[PDB]
Design a protein around this ligand. Sequence first.
Ligand SMILES: CC(C)N1CCC(c2cc(-c3ccc(F)cc3Cl)c3c(c2)N(c2c(Cl)cccc2Cl)C(=O)NC3)CC1
Ligand code: NA
Length: 347
Amino acid sequence: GPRAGFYRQELNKTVWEVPQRLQGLRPVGSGAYGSVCSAYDARLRQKVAVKKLSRPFQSLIHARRTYRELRLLKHLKHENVIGLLDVFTPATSIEDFSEVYLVTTLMGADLNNIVKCQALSDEHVQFLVYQLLRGLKYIHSAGIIHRDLKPSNVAVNEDSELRILDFGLARQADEEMTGYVATRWYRAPEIMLNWMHYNQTVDIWSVGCIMAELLQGKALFPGSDYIDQLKRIMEVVGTPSPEVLAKISSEHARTYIQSLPPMPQKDLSSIFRGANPLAIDLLGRMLVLDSDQRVSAAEALAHAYFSQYHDPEDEPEAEPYDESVEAKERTLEEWKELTYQEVLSFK
Ligand SMILES: CC(C)N1CCC(c2cc(-c3ccc(F)cc3Cl)c3c(c2)N(c2c(Cl)cccc2Cl)C(=O)NC3)CC1
Ligand code: NA
């Protein structure tokens, strides 16, 4: 395969074209985890993870997403956010430019892998959830919403160092059996009910669900379908008042909550029986229907549950992410031109 210094191989029904420095590429799974490989970067002298962006320029929207992806990754450099160690393309020119590769640190596990293998002591959950909220605070202070925070988006290594993997970046990758795979267990109810004007607080609902799962070793709201998902949420938090319902759903999705029987809020002391009362208290500031009332990531880091790790001076905010570039309309060849330069510019 042309392009000096590059080599080809078939990995998960796709050809991978990588520089000679990337050695021993090993697929992580099939389908969803199928565009990600382990490798060893001979130049960096370390294990890395490599991601092959599927179809970055299939259409305007994919090209815009590809660009945003790169732009956010290198804007949001943080101890608890996944960082780019490299970007490349087998392209010899922009006519050849049709695929993008992202090389980061190898963490080697996610929160599912962790819940599955350990029991997860209260003290272990404090450290993990601290680092998630810390990464999130930074992400939020830039004006970015994840919107799909879940255990497979949160990476953890042996040293229990945690990194948030993406920013709700989902685009042209496999969405056959891999979107059927995409779990709704961690999604904010206001997103579930297609409220158009949600904010940062959607991710705090998700952290709530993630933290509850770490403590109990099982999913909090494991819905089997869309109605079941809402029914399970409402059975724990209680059905909202009409006034709260009016600001967490689109007009049409209200029916889905109005046709349920009125249910009181359950006592979280009994749901999370022998958990640290501090864990229970916090969860109750997270698993709130009124997105208004939900604690922010900043306020949460301040909770006594994280008093072991809270250091206000080591919990940075970011500069606003500038969207002036993405505010203007461009063609596909332009988003391409722009992404090519972004790929080319990398260290
Ligand atoms: C199913 C969806 C939700 N998705 C979940 C995340 C997957 C995922 C993506 C990325 C990633 C992210 C950004 C980027 F620029 C480049 C890369 Cl490679 C990494 C990992 C996993 N892992 C990893 C884990 Cl966490 C467990 C096992 C094996 C591995 Cl390689 C890392 O170690 N770090 C990088 C991709 C698919
Ligand atoms: Na530090």
